[PDB]
Amino acid sequence: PLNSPNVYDVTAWRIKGQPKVTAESDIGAVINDIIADIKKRQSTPETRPGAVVIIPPGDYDLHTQVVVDVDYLTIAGFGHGFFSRSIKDNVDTTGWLNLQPGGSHIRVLTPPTSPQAFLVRRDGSPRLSGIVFKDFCLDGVSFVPDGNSYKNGKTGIDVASDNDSIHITGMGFVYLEHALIVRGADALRVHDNMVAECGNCVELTGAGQATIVSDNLMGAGPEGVTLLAENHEGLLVTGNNFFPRGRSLLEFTGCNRCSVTSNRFQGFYPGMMRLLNGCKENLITSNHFRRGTEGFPPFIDRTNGLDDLYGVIHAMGDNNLISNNLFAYDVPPGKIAPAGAQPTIMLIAGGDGNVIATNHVISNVDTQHVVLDGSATRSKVLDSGAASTITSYSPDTAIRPTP
Amino acid sequence: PLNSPNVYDVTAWRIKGQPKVTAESDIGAVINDIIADIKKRQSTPETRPGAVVIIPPGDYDLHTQVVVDVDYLTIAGFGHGFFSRSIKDNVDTTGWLNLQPGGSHIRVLTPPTSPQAFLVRRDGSPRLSGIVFKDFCLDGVSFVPDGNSYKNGKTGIDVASDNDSIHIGMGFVYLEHALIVRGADALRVHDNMVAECGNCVELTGAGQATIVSDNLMGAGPEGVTLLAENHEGLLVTGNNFFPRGRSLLEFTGCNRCSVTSNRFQGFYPGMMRLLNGCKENLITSNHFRRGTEGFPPFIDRTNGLDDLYGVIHAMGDNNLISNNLFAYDVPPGKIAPAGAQPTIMLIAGGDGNVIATNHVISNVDTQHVVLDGSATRSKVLDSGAASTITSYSPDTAIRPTPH
Amino acid sequence: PLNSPNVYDVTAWRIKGQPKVTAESDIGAVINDIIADIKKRQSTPETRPGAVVIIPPGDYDLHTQVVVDVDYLTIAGFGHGFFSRSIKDNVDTTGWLNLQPGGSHIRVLTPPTSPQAFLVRRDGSPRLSGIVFKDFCLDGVSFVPDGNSYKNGKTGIDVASDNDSIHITGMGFVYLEHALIVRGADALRVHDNMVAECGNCVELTGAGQATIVSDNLMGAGPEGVTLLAENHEGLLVTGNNFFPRGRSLLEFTGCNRCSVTSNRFQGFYPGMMRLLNGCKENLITSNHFRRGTEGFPPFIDRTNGLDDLYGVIHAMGDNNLISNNLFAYDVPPGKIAPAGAQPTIMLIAGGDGNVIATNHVISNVDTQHVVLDGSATRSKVLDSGAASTITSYSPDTAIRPTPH
């Protein structure tokens, strides 16, 4: 296709000895064969510039787990191919012109023994660098045992070893239990993707730093996360549009000095944002939060199991600034739990020196804009509601009511 | 090109029965013929993954409107090719090395009966999904009756039916309407150059869960830069809005949306309009600059609004307008009515709007905020000294900027 | 590869009469010959749509400076190929499976007297328009005399003429003294790039308008800038993650009516952000600032020459709004300069009408959240610390303490 051994077209690659296997049959086995070819040619630490694997638009089955263990591997298609399998599964489709995702369309059919479509892992060293996934579709085909479970044991991309300067962009993920997982992320960018109708959308696990999650459209399932970060430092989460049915939309555990800023958050349950297990010195600012109620009939009676005293924002940790946010809460009275409670918008569950400033709350019922747990210390609440709307069980909270 | 029938090169495709038609002579006829080939091969609701149409850099005339009615079509070039025709049309170009836009350059020469270059439409189910336009240039060639009218009846891309996960690296120039998307769900309009058009981006009818991000945009004095009708959860962030639209951001009946971290430069009153009951929107962390036209051919153009209309004009409930900077500089003899103090933020009506932490700087005496008599339960916090706030409403809570 | 004369594969292009000159041996000379072919074909001011130059993944040496003087030239690879040469040069690399950057990998080996790999310049009119650099790696290979100097005299991309609608995206820059320089920027976008372990990262010089710098990862060296802008108006700097070792992370000089919002800033020296020489009417809001100390042993004693009284933010100009930021200051007492000083977080060094509002500061030692110079006039400080954390040497500053 190009005059380089480092450019591969998956529809043109034949695996010698398995002349049966096509990119349609098992694009997994095809990409694994490509990667073996790269290793044969790229032999030394001075000759390993990587390669591009090109996925033309089409339907491709993947049976065999692709193991990605080379730097600067770009896997690229020509479109994210997103399609709502969740609407398809739940309505009459008589006369429908289309019934599945497309674009550069990888149907993930991995075994239980090898559940992730792409396993990005190198046990040797150094860290994997500069790997790029872009412009293709990873589709888990269905949920198990029905369409509404958000469970199938499949993962789209799982980066399992420490990594630097990975770039995930223009992707589509649908109907995977775990769309994207990146462990030990440094200088990662998850940018401008469509990640929806998955049990879990983006999991940033183990630890990480210097990461940006931006301009993504994301919606998860009621037992899974939308964005999760574990032990991140200096994570920037910005310009994202989070919607749907995750148990949460943003979940940080032990994340410090991160910024969640200029996003849009729409959820149907308490606990849309959870700053857990000692999250400190984070900026939570200039976001729009919408707490509403499930409208799609097949999901009306399912919840994430939390009540409305949990908080739209639930914070456990130190010295966070939660400021300059709009919260719009609208839940039918008969749907609030426990029955008769005032919902809590921001709950400070514990921690020292949190500052809550210039937040505007609107709710259909009486709400506590802020509740501070009895264990909260040295808190400030400025202009986030009248005195009526701020409950401190802690004796030491400084409160300026909104004029 | 690749080993897939789902990858098309426009410069290589020949129309059976019309051998002389080329991509140069009528790229529209070529793409239509490509699209028919796709529809011929992709015959069933389970075998429609879509395709890519690639547009090499070059000059291409479009005479026939392209109708896009297949999911997961990608039309991609290699450059947005933007060129200032407006400067060209108004100055001495003696010795100019280039006179028109380029890149993957489509000159839009449609008939007045089907004036949209790309018409994105399906009668039938389901919604059109996952269409991509990227990295090419749509050029309306000239304005009539002359180069400064911003009128030619041409549209770049017009998405006419309800749609999901559409993704628009483009350049648009000298079109009366650059991009229109009706019934957007999970649309991304990202990192485009959309300038010297009558109107730039119109998101019409209704929509949800859309992101407009990282765009450069400038319109004309009778048109809109960004418009949204009846959107919920629209996120507008990272954009640099400049030029000469009647307005820069225009919402009508949009609720629970967020406009954050943009730059806004305009030359007339009414740069931002939140109209006909916009509620619970976040308008924050933006820079507004109101200046005066400096390009002679447009020195006498206005949008018909006086300086009492507001830099922001808002009619609706419970919006938070906070952490913005407003820098107003217009010569005394260009302010209307003569002798009036310009208004920076006008709350035209609505309940429970909160104006917080805004810095205004102006060359003349201005009212930072004027609240209409009809506004109820408004708050104005730290957005000017007392002498810069006018509330004709009797129940506005005001905290002057100290001193 | 496609049926158009405007698409070039650098690996397929033969320079007629120079069979030895390849993309591998000198991709600079290859690209210049491609440029010559474009000009040969694209011969009138109505027949210049430009071209795309495609760079497959591989290792390519550049010895000859590429001079870009045609509109709508796209140079495109498949991969930004970033690799930490700085870590490589400083630790034990036994058994390391890779020792250099990759992707679409251009090794910059320019002569001392034409240092820039790409020179984007046109004498004449109009302004160069619509040029696109994307998805490739520019790698200056080494710093001299050792890998830790951040010095080699090399530049990745230097745009020297006034320009319109240039787009730089998906790039990797590494080990260059200057990664990217753009003079006379109008409607520039520097978007979603990796610009690290360079002496300087992005310099927007001369003057400029209506530019966006967004969604980048950037880290510079102790003598250079990360992002610099000179005399820009309406620059928007957003969604970036600034880290590392630049003398500063954001440096404006004479910039007006610009906006810096929703970024992350991590630095190891004072002066992380500098609004210098009469910056007016700028918005600095919704940012996260971390001032820390160096943790990588080879650089422990490197300084940028400033003390902790200079400020995390240093501002000289009028009517800036510095609001809704978080500053997390952690520097061991033995590392603070001058010894025993209270560090300053935000310093208003001069100017009229500046407004500091709703800022949260956490520091390991006592700090002054805001210090205002004696010459500052009409300043406001709101909710950016207790009274004891605000110092105004100007007598006209209005101060509201953070309550309690």
Residue count of chain B: 403
Tell me, yes or no, whether A279 and A198 share the same domain: no
| Stretch (H or E) spanning B137 | strand B137-139
Sorted by sequence, the CB contacts under 8 Å of residue B392 that are 6+ apart come out as B370, B371, B372, B373
Sorted by sequence, the CB contacts under 8 Å of residue B302 that are 6+ apart come out as B221, B268
Tell me, yes or no, whether A260 and A197 share the same domain: no
Residue type, A144: V
User: The tokens of A238 are what?
Assistant: 């910005």
Residue count of chain A: 403
B230–chain A Cβ distance below 8 A for any pair: no
| A-interface mutation test, from C78, C226, C260, most A Cβ less than 10 A away | C78
* Contact present, A296 and A273 (Cβ < 8 Å): no
| Stretch (H or E) spanning A369 | strand A368-372
Number of domains in chain C: 1
Residue A176 vs residues A139, A195, A204, A294: alpha-carbon distances, Å: 6, 10, 16, 21
* Contact present, A40 and A97 (Cβ < 8 Å): no
Q: Distance (Å, rounded) from C-alpha C179 to C-alpha C196?
A: 9
Sorted by sequence, the CB contacts under 8 Å of residue C51 that are 6+ apart come out as B57, C6, C7, C8, C34, C38, C42, C70, C72, C73, C74
Residue C42, CB-side half-sphere exposure with 13 Å CA sphere: 30
Sorted by sequence, the CB contacts under 8 Å of residue C359 that are 6+ apart come out as C322, C323, C324, C325, C326, C327, C345, C346, C369, C370, C383, C384, C385
Question: The domain spanning residue C266 has which CATH number?
Answer: 2.160.20.10
B323–chain C Cβ distance below 8 A for any pair: yes
Tell me, yes or no, whether A169 and A103 share the same domain: yes
* Chain A residues touching C286 at Cβ < 8 A: 259, 261-262, 283, 285-286, 324
B54–chain C Cβ distance below 8 A for any pair: yes
The whole domain housing A118 covers 1-88+98-137+152-202
Q: Distance (Å, rounded) from C-alpha B44 to C-alpha B26?
A: 30
Tell me, yes or no, whether A22 and A168 share the same domain: yes
Burial environment of residue B376 by CB neighbours within 10 A (0 to 12, 13 to 18, 19 or more)? middle
In the structure, how many helices (H) and strands (E) does chain A have?
2, 41
Residue B353, helix vs strand vs coil? coil
Q: Within 10 A of C92 (CB to CB), how many other CB atoms are there? A: 6
Residue type, A354: N
Tell me, yes or no, whether A30 and A159 share the same domain: yes
| Stretch (H or E) spanning B27 | helix B23-41
Q: Distance (Å, rounded) from C-alpha A5 to C-alpha A47?
A: 13
ω into residue A126 within 30 of 0, thus cis?
yes
Q: Distance (Å, rounded) from C-alpha A83 to C-alpha A196?
A: 9
Taking an 8 Å cut-off on Cβ atoms, the answer to whether C259 and B325 are in contact is yes
Q: Distance (Å, rounded) from C-alpha A329 to C-alpha A238?
A: 22
Q: Within 10 A of A284 (CB to CB), how many other CB atoms are there? A: 29
For C95-161, the three-class secondary structure string (H helix, E strand, C coil) is CECCCCCCCEEEEECCCCCCCEEEEECCCCCCCEECCEEECCEEECCCCCCCCCCCCCCCEEEEECC
Can you point out the beta strands (E) in B161-257?
163-164, 171-173, 177-185, 188-190, 193-195, 199-208, 211-213, 216-219, 224-229, 231-232, 235-237, 240-243, 247-252
The single-letter DSSP state of residue B24 is: H
Residue C76, helix vs strand vs coil? strand
Tell me, yes or no, whether A63 and A180 share the same domain: yes
Sign of CA dihedral A240, A245, A249, A251: negative
Tell me, yes or no, whether A174 and A323 share the same domain: no
* Chain A residues touching C241 at Cβ < 8 A: 210-212, 234, 236
- C161 falls within a domain: yes
Residue of C1, C212, C355 lying closest to B240 (CB–CB): C212
Q: What angle do CA C166, A260, B398 make, to 5 degrees?
A: 100
Residue A283, helix vs strand vs coil? strand
What b-and-e string marks burial along C291-330, b requiring 16 or more CB atoms within 10 Å of the CB? bbebeeeebeebebebbbbbbbbbbbbbbbbbbbbbbbbe
For B382-396, give the DSSP string: SSS-GGGEEE-STT-
Q: How far is CA B188 from the centre of its chain?
A: 12
Q: Distance (Å, rounded) from C-alpha B167 to C-alpha B162?
A: 14
Tell me, yes or no, whether A156 and A278 share the same domain: no
- A334 falls within a domain: yes
- C348 falls within a domain: yes
Long-range contacts of B109-113 (CB under 8 A, 24+ apart): B109/B61, B109/B62, B109/B63, B109/B141, B110/B28, B110/B62, B110/B63, B110/B64, B110/B65, B110/B154, B111/B63, B111/B65, B112/B153
Closest CA to B78 of C52, C164, C70, C80: C52
| Stretch (H or E) spanning B86 | helix B85-90
A95–chain B Cβ distance below 8 A for any pair: yes
Q: Distance (Å, rounded) from C-alpha C157 to C-alpha C163?
A: 14
Residue B85 vs residues A330, B138, B141, B340: alpha-carbon distances, Å: 49, 13, 8, 37
Residue of B76, B130, B209 lying closest to A241 (CB–CB): B209
User: The tokens of A11 are what?
Assistant: 């529809």
Closest CA to A353 of A287, A278, A258: A278
B263–chain A Cβ distance below 8 A for any pair: no
Closest CA to A326 of A308, A339, A312: A312
Tell me, yes or no, whether A183 and A324 share the same domain: no
User: The tokens of B220 are what?
Assistant: 């004309």
Chain A contact partners (≥3 CB pairs within 8 A): B, C
Closest CA to A331 of A269, A242, A248: A269
Residue B105, helix vs strand vs coil? strand
A402–chain C Cβ distance below 8 A for any pair: no
User: The tokens of A348 are what?
Assistant: 């400070």
Taking an 8 Å cut-off on Cβ atoms, the answer to whether C382 and B361 are in contact is no
Residue type, B385: A
Residue count of chain C: 404
B323–chain A Cβ distance below 8 A for any pair: yes
Q: Distance (Å, rounded) from C-alpha A55 to C-alpha A174?
A: 18
Name the CA radius of gyration of chain C, rounded. Answer: 23
Residue of A189, A281, A324 lying closest to C324 (CB–CB): A324
Resolution for this experimental structure (Å)? 2.2
Residue of A6, A46, A189 lying closest to C192 (CB–CB): A189
Residue B124 vs residues B130, B250, C129: alpha-carbon distances, Å: 16, 31, 42
Sign of CA dihedral C186, C192, C193, C197: positive
Q: Distance (Å, rounded) from C-alpha B382 to C-alpha B187?
A: 36
Can you point out the beta strands (E) in C292-382?
313-316, 321-323, 326-329, 344-350, 355-357, 360-363, 368-372, 380-382
CA dihedral B332, B338, B339, B343 (to 10 degrees): -80
Residue C25, helix vs strand vs coil? helix
Residue type, A178: H
Q: Within 10 A of B3 (CB to CB), how many other CB atoms are there? A: 14
Q: Look up tokens 């514990």; give the residue.
A: A350
- A279 falls within a domain: yes
Name the CA radius of gyration of chain B, rounded. Answer: 23
B238–chain C Cβ distance below 8 A for any pair: yes
Sorted by sequence, the CB contacts under 8 Å of residue B250 that are 6+ apart come out as B224, B225, B226, B227, B228, B272, B273, B275
The single-letter DSSP state of residue B341 is: P
Q: Distance (Å, rounded) from C-alpha B276 to C-alpha C210?
A: 31
Tell me, yes or no, whether A356 and A281 share the same domain: yes
Q: How far is CA C25 from the centre of its chain?
A: 30
Closest CA to A290 of A325, A256, A324: A325
Tell me, yes or no, whether A295 and A197 share the same domain: no
Taking an 8 Å cut-off on Cβ atoms, the answer to whether B122 and A290 are in contact is no
Q: Within 10 A of C338 (CB to CB), how many other CB atoms are there? A: 8
* Contact present, B52 and A9 (Cβ < 8 Å): no
Residue B322, helix vs strand vs coil? strand
Residue A263 vs residues A44, A326, A330, C167, C262: alpha-carbon distances, Å: 44, 11, 19, 25, 10
Q: Within 10 A of B394 (CB to CB), how many other CB atoms are there? A: 8
For A197-240, give the DSSP string: S-SEEEEEEEEEES-EEES-EEEE-TTSEEEEEESEES-EEES-
Residue A25, helix vs strand vs coil? helix
Q: Distance (Å, rounded) from C-alpha B362 to C-alpha B378?
A: 24
Residue of C9, C172, C404 lying closest to A3 (CB–CB): C9
Q: Distance (Å, rounded) from C-alpha B184 to C-alpha B165?
A: 8
Residue type, C373: D
* Contact present, C327 and C270 (Cβ < 8 Å): no
- Phi/psi at B25 (5° precision): -80, -40
- C152 falls within a domain: yes
Q: How far is CA C173 from the centre of its chain?
A: 10
Q: What angle do CA A364, A365, A368 make, to 5 degrees?
A: 115
* Contact present, C49 and B105 (Cβ < 8 Å): yes
- C334 falls within a domain: yes
Q: Within 10 A of A127 (CB to CB), how many other CB atoms are there? A: 18
Straight-line distance from the first to the last Cα atom of chain A, in angstroms, rounded to the nearest whole number: 68
| Stretch (H or E) spanning C276 | strand C273-276
Q: Distance (Å, rounded) from C-alpha B395 to C-alpha B390?
A: 12
* Contact present, B139 and B173 (Cβ < 8 Å): yes
Q: Distance (Å, rounded) from C-alpha B270 to C-alpha B277?
A: 16
* Contact present, C321 and C284 (Cβ < 8 Å): yes
Residue C208, helix vs strand vs coil? strand
* Contact present, A101 and B130 (Cβ < 8 Å): yes
- A146 falls within a domain: no
Q: Within 10 A of B181 (CB to CB), how many other CB atoms are there? A: 24
- C176 falls within a domain: yes
A-C C-beta contacts closer than 8 Å: 222
Q: Distance (Å, rounded) from C-alpha B352 to C-alpha B123?
A: 42
Sorted by sequence, the CB contacts under 8 Å of residue C193 that are 6+ apart come out as C80, C168, C169, C170, C171, C172, C173, C216, C217, C218
